[PDB]
Design a protein around this ligand. Structure first.
Ligand SMILES: CCCCCCCCCCCCCCCCCC(=O)OC[C@H](COP(=O)(O)OCCN)OC(=O)CCCCCCCCCCCCCCCCC
Ligand SMILES: CCCCCCCCCCCCCCCCCC(=O)OC[C@H](COP(=O)(O)OCCN)OC(=O)CCCCCCCCCCCCCCCCC
Ligand SMILES: CCCCCCCCCCCCCCCCCC(=O)OC[C@H](COP(=O)(O)OCCN)OC(=O)CCCCCCCCCCCCCCCCC
Ligand SMILES: CCCCCCCCCCCCCCCCCC(=O)OC[C@H](COP(=O)(O)OCCN)OC(=O)CCCCCCCCCCCCCCCCC
Ligand SMILES: CCCCCCCCCCCCCCCCCC(=O)OC[C@H](COP(=O)(O)OCCN)OC(=O)CCCCCCCCCCCCCCCCC
Lengths: 598, 504
C-alpha cells in the first residue's frame, strides 16, 4: 500500500519514454513498454487492494509534498485511499490494461503507435491522480489531464479535419465544465477555508449554521463540473460528435476513465450534497432527463459507435439518477459493471469495424451472425448486459439496486423514468443487434466479467459512503420482477419490429411527424444546433468584427489628426514675403488685442 | 554592493562584444554568452546568499541588499539600488531570458553582429536596472534607456520578408507609445517630489522618502493615473496595446529580440512597487476601473488571438490576455492574488519565450508566418510540433505548468475579494483554451495546404532542442513545485499588501 504513488509514476514513465521515443522504436518494444507500464500499474493496484483488505479496511494518506502555502492557503500533494478510491483505481487499471493489450494487438500497422500508447498512458496516470487525490486541486489536476488526453486522443488521426474539430469541441465543453468546477473550488475555499475532502465535510455544518446559500451554490457548481465531464445535461454535446476516433481509446473513455469522473465527484463529495438535498434532487432530475433523452437519441441512430455513445450517455444518466436518490453504492456498482460491458461492447464493435474495413451504417450490414461467430457472441453478451437481462447479467443487479434506492427513498417519478429508460435501453441495443446481425484474451475476460461473475464482485463501500436504505423483501421482489418484465418486453418488441421484414418500422418512419421525430432525435434533440446558434456563431461574428483591431485604430486617430493638422499648417509656408509681413501684422494685432482685453 | 555590477556587467560585456568584432564574426556571440553567464551566476549567487526562504516581513521598506551613491546632489538624486525577493526573481528571469536570447541568435554570421549584440546587452542591462533601481529618476532612466536599442533592432535588423517602411512604422509606434507614457510618468514623479518638498523642505527623489507625504484627494488620483497610464501601455492594457503585435510581427526573425526587449515583466513590477505603496487611497478608489480594464483586455486579447492568421501576432495577443489577468490580480489587495500574479508572470515569460523560439525556428523551416499556407506539419517535422503543442498547452493554463498555478491563485484571491470579475475572468480562461486549440488546429494538424508543407523538412539541431527542453523542464518544475518561488517573494509581497490594506 506504500506503493500508492507507483500507480501514478509508472504510466508517467511509460508516457515519457514513448513520447521521447518518437516512433524510432519497433512496434514490439513499444507494445511491451506501454502494456507493461499499464500492467505494472494494475499489479501494484492489486497488491494495494490485497494489503487494504489485509489491514482492516481503513483509509490511508500518503502526503508526497506540499503544493502551495500562502498564509491560510495550504494545498498539498497528498494521495488518499478508501473503498471508493480503491474501487475506482481497480476498475480503471484493470479495464485500461485489457484495453491496452487489445490496442497492442489492434493498432498494428499504424503511424503513431508509440504516440498513441504515450497518450493513453498519460490518460491512465491522470485518471489515477483523479481517483487518488486528497484535496480538490490535485483532483482538478487529474481533471485537466483527463480533458487534455481526451483532446489528444480523440483527434488521433489528424489528417482528417472532422476528428480535430470534434476534439476541439470536446475540449471546449469539458473546459466549460472545468470552469464550473473551478467556481465550486473558489466558493468552497472562500467559505470553509480548506480544500481537503474530509476537512470540508467536518467543517461544513459548523460554518453554515445561519445560512446555507453559499454551500448550495458550491454543490450546484460541483454539479455543473460533473455534468461538464460526464456528458450530462447541458454539456452533453461532445460524446457522439467526438466518437469518430479509434476504438480502444473510445472504450477507454466510455468504460473506465472519463465519463465516470463526475460520478466520482458526486460520490466523493456526498456529504456536502447531503447538507443540500435540493441540489442532490437536481442531480437525480438531470440524470433522469439525460438518460431518457439518450434513449430517445439512440432510438433512431444509424451508426454503431453513435449508438454505443448514446448508450453510455444513458448509463451515466442512470448513475446520476442513482446518486440523486441517495443510492451511492448502487451508482458505483453500476459504474464498475458498465465499465466492463461497455469495454466489451466497444472492443467487439472495433472488431466488426476492422472485419469490414469501413464505418458502414447499420442498414448496409446484415447476415453477420454467421460470418463471425465469436464477435457475434461477444456483442450478444455485451448487449444483454447493457439491456439488463435478468438472472444472467450484472447490469440487471446494478439497475435493480439503483431502483431499490429510488423506491426506498420515495422517488416514484424518478423510478418511472428508470423503468422507461430500461425499456428504451433494451429496445435500442437489440434493435442495433437485430439490424446488424440479421437479414481474444481481453474479449474472453470481459465476456466473463460482463456476466453474473461481475455481479459477484462487490465494491468495499461499507464505512466510506452512507448505507442506502434497503428495500423490503416483498417490495424488492415486485421491483425485480417489474424490471425483468419491462426488459424482456423490450427484447420481444425489438424482436417483433426488426428481426423480420421491417413493415411497421418504415411505415411510421416515413410519415412526416415520424420523420420529424427521427430528424429531431438523430441530432440529439437539436442541442448542437442550439449551441452553434447561441454560443459559436456570435463568437465567430465578434472575432470577424474585431479582427481589424478597432481599439488600435481608435488610438491611431490622434496620429491621423496630427498628420492632418501638420499638412494644414504647412499650407501657410507658401514662400511669399508679403504674406509673411501680413502675418506679422496679424500677430501684432492679436497680441495687442489680447493684452488690451487682459 | 553587487547590484551595480549586476547592471554594468551586460554593458561592459556588450562593449567588448562591439570591440571584438574585428577579431572575427563568430567572436562576439561567445563574449555575450560569457557575460550573460556571469550575470545569471551573480543573480543565482544573490538568491543563495540573501536567505529569502526564512525571511520575515518587516514592512515597507525592507530591502535585502541596498546600494547608495549620489548622482545629482542638486536635486538630491541618488543612484540607489535595492534588491528584495521579487526583484531577485525578476532579475533571475531576466538573466535566463538573456541567456536564451544569446543562444537563439547563435546562427548569425552577418557583418554587423557586434552592434546587434551590443544593443541586446544594453537592453538586458536596462531591464535589469529597471528591476533593481528604486530611485525614481534612476528607475525612469533605465525605463527609457531600454527603448532606444530595441527600437534600433526593430527598425534595422527586423523582418526581412517585409518592407523597411513597415518595420519603421512598428518601431516608431512602439517608441512613441513607450516614451510619451514615460514622459507622463516623469510628470507624475516630478509633481510628487514637488509636493513632498512643499510639505517637508527636502529635495529627494528617493523611494522611501516619498511614501510618507500629505496626499490630497484629487492630486494623488492624478499621480496614480499617470503612473498607471505608463505601466498600462507597457503591460500592455487595452486600448494602449497596439504596439505589441506590431513590434512582434516586425521583429528580427531570430526570436532573441522578443525575449530580450518585449518580454519585460517591468510594468506589473512597477504597479506592485510604485503604484500601490505610494498611492494606497488612490489605488483603492481606482481598483474597479483597473480590474474591469483587465477583464476587457483578457476577452479582447482572446478575440484577437482567435482571429489572427499570423502566429507571432497570436502569441502577442496571448501576452495581452495574460497581462490583463495580472492587472486584475494587482488591484485586489490579496496576498494570494499577488503570489499568483508573480507565478503567472514568471510562467508567462517562460511559456511565451518557448513559443517565440519555436515560432522563429518554424519560420526558418517553412519561410512563412501565414497559418493558412501550412498544415499537417506533425508528419513532416521532427521535434518542433510536439514542443509547440506543449507550450500551447502551457499557455492555456494547464496543470503541470506554472500558468495554471498562477492563474488559479490569482482567481482564488480575487474571489476572496471580488466574485463577479473572478467568474468572468475564468470564462476568459475558457476563451484562452479556445484560441490555443484554434492555433494548434490551424498550424500543425490537418492537410498540407501548400507545397512548402508537402515536403519533408529538416529537424532542429541540438542547441535549439536543448534550450526548448530546458524551458519545458523549468515549466514543469514551476507547475509541480512552485513553493521555493513562493517563499522567495513572500516578504516583499507581504510588505506591499500590508502597506496597501492596513493604510485604508
Ligand atoms: C501528477 C502526475 C501527472 C498527472 C497528469 C498530468 C497532466 C499534465 C501534464 C501534461 C504534459 C503535456 C502533455 C502533452 C504532451 C504533448 C507532446 C507529445 O505528446 O509529443 C509526442 C511526440 C511523439 O510523437 P511521434 O508521433 O512519436 O513523433 C514522430 C514524428 N515526430 O513527442 C516528441 O516529439 C518528443 C517529446 C516532446 C515533448 C513531450 C512532453 C514533454 C513534457 C513532459 C516531460 C518533461 C521532462 C521530464 C522532467 C520534468 C521535470 C522533473
Ligand atoms: C447551456 C447552459 C450552459 C452553458 C455553458 C457555457 C456555454 C457552452 C458552449 C459550448 C460550445 C460547444 C461548441 C464549441 C465547438 C468548438 C470546436 C469546433 O467546432 O471548431 C470548429 C472550428 C475550427 O476552426 P479553426 O480551427 O479555428 O480554424 C479556422 C478555420 N476553420 O472552430 C470554430 O468554429 C470556432 C468555435 C469556437 C467556440 C467558442 C465557444 C465559446 C463559449 C463561451 C461561453 C460563455 C458563457 C458565459
Ligand atoms: C412509453 C414510452 C415508449 C418509448 C418507446 C417506443 C418504442 C416504439 C417506437 C420507437 C421504435 C420504432 O418503431 O422505431 C422506428 C423508427 C426508427 O427506426 P429506424 O431503424 O430508424 O427506421 C428505418 C427506416 N428507414 O422510429 C422513428 O422514426 C420514430 C418513431 C416515433 C414513435 C412515436 C414517439 C412518440 C413520442
Ligand atoms: C490614457 C490617455 C491619456 C494619457 C495619454 C498619455 C500619452 C501616452 C500614451 C498614448 C500615446 C498615443 C500615441 C498614438 C500614436 C502612436 C504612433 C502611431 O500610430 O504613429 C503612426 C504614424 C507613423 O506611422 P506611418 O503610418 O508610417 O506614418 C505615415 C507617414 N506620413 O505617426 C505619424 O504619422 C505621426 C505621429 C505623431 C506622434 C503621435 C501622436 C501624438 C499626439 C498627442 C497624443 C497625446 C496623448 C493623447 C491621449 C491618448 C490618445 C487618445
Ligand atoms: C496629454 C498628455 C500629458 C498629460 C497631461 C498633462 C498634465 C496635466 C496636469 C493636470 C493637473 C491638474 C491640477 C488641478 C488642481 C490645481 C490647483 C490645486 O489646488 O492644486 C493642489 C496642489 C496645490 O496646492 P497645495 O497647497 O500644494 O496642496 C497640496 C496638498 N497636499 O497642487 C500641487 O501641489 C500639484 C498638483 C499636481 C497634480 C498632478 C499632475 C500630474 C498628474 C499626472 C499626469 C497627468 C494625468 C495622466
Amino acid at each position: 500500500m506504500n506503493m500508492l504513488a507507483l500507480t501514478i509514476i509508472l504510466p508517467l514513465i511509460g508516457f515519457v519514454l514513448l513520447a521521447f521515443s518518437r516512433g524510432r522504436w519497433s512496434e514490439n518494444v513499444s507494445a511491451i513498454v506501454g502494456v507493461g507500464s499499464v500492467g505494472l500499474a494494475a499489479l501494484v493496484t492489486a497488491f494495494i487492494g490485497v494489503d487494504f483488505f489485509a489491514n482492516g479496511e481503513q483509509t490511508y494518506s500518503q502526503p508526497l509534498w506540499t503544493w502551495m502555502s500562502v498564509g491560510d492557503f495550504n494545498i498539498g500533494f497528498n494521495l488518499v485511499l478508501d473503498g471508493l478510491s480503491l474501487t475506482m483505481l481497480s476498475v480503471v487499471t484493470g479495464v485500461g490494461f485489457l484495453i491496452h493489450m487489445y490496442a497492442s494487438w489492434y493498432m498494428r500497422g499504424e503511424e503513431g503507435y508509440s504516440r498513441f500508447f504515450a497518450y493513453t498512458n498519460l490518460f491512465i496516470a491522470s485518471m489515477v491522480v483523479l481517483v487518488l487525490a486528497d484535496n480538490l486541486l490535485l483532483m482538478y489536476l487529474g481533471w485537466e489531464g483527463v480533458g487534455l488526453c481526451s483532446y489528444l486522443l480523440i483527434g488521433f488521426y489528424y489528417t482528417d479535419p472532422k476528428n480535430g474539430a470534434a476534439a476541439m469541441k470536446a475540449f471546449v465543453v469539458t473546459r466549460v465544465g472545468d470552469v464550473f468546477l473551478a467556481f465550486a473550488l473558489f466558493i468552497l475555499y472562500n467559505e470553509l477555508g480548506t480544500l481537503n475532502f474530509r476537512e470540508m465535510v467536518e467543517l461544513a455544518p459548523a460554518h453554515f449554521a445561519d445560512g446555507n446559500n453559499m454551500l448550495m451554490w458550491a454543490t450546484l457548481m460541483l454539479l455543473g463540473g460533473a455534468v461538464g465531464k460526464s456528458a450530462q445535461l447541458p454539456l452533453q454535446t461532445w460524446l457522439a460528435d467526438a466518437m469518430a476516433g479509434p476504438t480502444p481509446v473510445s472504450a477507454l473513455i466510455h468504460a473506465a476513465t472519463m465519463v465516470t469522473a463526475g460520478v466520482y465527484l458526486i460520490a466523493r463529495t456526498h456529504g456536502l450534497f447531503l447538507m443540500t438535498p435540493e441540489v442532490l434532487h437536481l442531480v437525480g432530475i438531470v440524470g433522469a432527463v439525460t438518460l431518457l433523452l439518450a434513449g430517445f437519441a439512440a432510438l433512431v441512430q444509424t451508426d454503431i459507435k453513435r449508438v454505443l455513445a448514446y448508450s453510455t450517455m444513458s448509463q451515466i444518466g442512470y448513475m446520476f439518477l442513482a446518486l440523486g436518490v441517495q443510492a451511492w453504492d448502487a451508482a458505483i456498482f453500476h459504474l464498475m459493471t458498465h465499465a466492463f460491458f461497455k469495454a466489451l461492447l466497444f472492443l467487439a464493435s472495433g472488431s466488426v469495424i476492422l472485419a469490414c474495413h469501413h464505418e458502414q451504417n447499420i442498414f448496409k450490414m446484415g447476415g453477420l451472425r454467421k460470418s463471425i461467430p465469436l464477435v457475434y457472441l461477444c456483442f450478444l453478451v455485451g448487449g444483454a448486459a447493457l439491456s439488463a437481462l435478468p438472472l444472467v447479467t450484472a447490469g440487471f443487479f446494478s439497475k435493480d439496486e439503483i431502483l431499490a434506492g429510488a423506491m426506498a427513498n420515495g422517488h416514484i417519478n424518478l423510478m418511472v423514468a428508470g423503468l422507461v429508460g430500461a425499456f428504451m435501453t433494451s429496445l435500442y441495443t437489440f434493435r442495433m443487434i437485430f439490424i446488424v446481425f440479421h437479414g481474444s484474451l481481453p474479449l474472453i475476460v470481459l465476456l466473463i466479467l460482463s456476466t453474473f461473475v461481475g455481479a459477484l464482485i462487490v465494491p468495499p463501500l461499507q464505512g466510506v459512503l452512507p448505507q442506502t436504505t434497503e428495500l423490503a423483501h416483498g417490495s424488492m421482489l415486485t421491483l425485480e420482477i417489474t424490471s425483468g418484465v419491462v426488459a424482456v418486453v423490450g427484447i420481444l418488441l425489438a424482436a417483433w419490429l426488426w428481426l423480420g421484414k421491417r413493415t411497421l418500422v418504415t411505415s411510421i418512419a416515413n410519415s412526416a411527424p415520424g420523420r420529424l421525430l427521427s430528424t429531431w432525435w438523430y441530432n440529439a434533440w437539436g442541442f448542437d444546433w442550439l449551441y452553434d446558434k447561441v454560443f459559436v456563431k456570435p463568437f465567430l461574428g465578434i472575432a470577424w468584427l474585431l479582427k481589424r483591431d478597432p481599439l488600435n485604430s481608435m488610438m491611431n486617430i490622434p496620429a491621423v489628426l496630427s498628420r492632418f493638422a501638420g499638412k494644414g499648417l504647412l499650407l501657410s509656408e507658401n514662400g511669399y514675403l508679403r504674406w509673411y509681413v501680413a502675418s506679422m501684422s496679424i500677430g501684432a494685432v492679436v497680441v495687442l488685442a489680447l493684452l488690451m482685453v487682459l | 554592493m553587487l547590484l551595480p555590477w549586476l547592471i554594468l556587467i551586460p554593458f561592459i560585456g556588450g562593449f567588448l562584444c562591439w570591440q571584438t568584432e574585428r577579431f572575427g564574426v563568430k567572436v562576439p556571440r561567445w563574449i555575450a554568452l560569457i557575460t550573460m553567464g556571469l550575470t545569471l551566476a551573480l543573480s543565482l549567487q544573490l538568491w543563495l546568499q540573501g536567505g529569502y526562504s526564512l525571511t520575515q516581513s518587516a514592512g515597507i521598506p525592507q530591502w535585502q541588499s541596498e546600494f547608495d551613491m549620489p548622482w545629482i546632489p542638486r536635486f538630491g538624486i541618488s543612484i540607489h539600488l535595492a534588491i528584495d525577493g521579487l526583484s531577485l526573481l525578476m532579475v533571475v528571469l531576466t538573466g535566463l531570458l538573456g541567456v536564451l536570447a544569446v543562444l537563439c541568435s547563435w546562427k548569425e554570421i552577418e557583418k554587423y553582429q557586434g552592434f546587434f549584440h551590443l544593443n541586446l546587452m544594453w537592453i538586458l542591462g536596462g531591464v535589469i536596472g529597471v528591476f533593481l533601481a528604486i530611485d525614481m529618476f534612476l528607475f525612469f532612466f533605465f525605463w527609457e534607456m531600454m527603448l532606444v536599442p530595441m527600437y534600433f533592432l526593430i527598425a534595422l535588423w527586423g523582418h526581412k520578408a517585409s518592407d523597411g517602411k513597415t518595420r519603421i512604422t512598428a518601431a516608431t509606434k512602439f517608441f512613441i507609445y513607450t516614451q510619451a507614457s514615460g514622459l507622463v510618468m516623469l510628470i507624475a514623479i516630478l509633481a510628487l517630489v514637488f509636493v513632498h518638498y512643499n510639505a517637508t523642505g527636502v529635495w529627494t527623489f528617493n523611494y522611501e522618502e516619498l511614501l510618507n507625504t500629505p496626499m490630497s484627494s484629487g492630486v494623488e488620483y492624478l499621480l496614480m493615473l499617470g503612473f498607471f497610464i505608463a505601466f498600462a501601455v507597457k503591460m500592455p492594457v487595452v486600448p494602449l496595446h497596439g504596439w505589441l503585435p506590431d513590434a512582434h510581427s516586425q521583429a528580427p526573425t531570430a526570436g532573441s529580440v522578443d525575449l530580450a526587449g518585449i518580454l519585460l515583466k517591468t510594468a506589473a513590477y512597477g504597479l506592485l512597487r510604485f503604484s500601490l505603496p505610494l498611492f494606497p487611497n488612490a489605488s483603492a478608489e481606482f481598483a474597479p476601473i483597473a480590474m474591469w480594464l483587465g477583464v476587457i483586455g483578457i476577452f479582447y486579447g482572446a478575440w484577437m488571438a482567435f482571429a489572427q492568421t499570423d502566429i507571432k501576432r497570436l502569441i502577442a495577443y496571448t501576452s495581452v490576455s495574460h497581462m490583463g489577468f495580472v492587472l486584475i490580480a494587482i488591484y485586489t489587495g490579496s496576498q494570494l492574488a499577488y503570489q499568483g500574479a508573480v507565478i503567472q508572470m514568471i510562467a508567462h515569460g517562460l511559456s511565451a519565450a518557448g513559443l517565440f523560439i519555436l515560432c522563429g525556428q518554424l519560420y526558418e523551416r517553412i519561410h512563412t508566418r501565414d497559418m493558412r499556407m501550412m498544415g499537417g506539419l506533425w508528419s513532416k517535422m521532427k521535434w518542433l510540433p510536439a514542443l509547440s503543442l506543449f507550450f500551447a498547452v502551457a499557455t492555456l493554463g494547464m496543470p503541470g505548468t506554472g500558468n495554471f498555478v498562477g492563474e488559479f491563485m490569482i482567481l482564488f484571491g480575487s474571489f476572496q475579494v471580488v466574485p463577479v470579475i473572478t467568474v468572468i475572468s475564468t470564462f476568459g480562461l475558457v476563451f484562452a483554451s479556445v484560441y490555443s486549440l484554434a492555433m494548434l488546429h490551424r498550424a500543425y494538424f490537418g492537410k498540407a495546404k501548400s507545397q512548402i508543407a508537402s515536403q519533408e523538412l529538416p529537424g532542429m539541431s541540438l542547441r535549439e532542442l536543448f534550450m526548448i527542453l530546458l524551458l519545458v523542464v523549468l515549466l514543469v518544475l514551476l507547475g509541480f513545485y512552485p513553493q521555493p518561488i513562493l517563499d522567495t517573494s513572500h516578504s516583499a509581497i507581504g510588505n506591499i499588501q500590508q502597506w496597501f490594506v492596513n493604510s485604508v
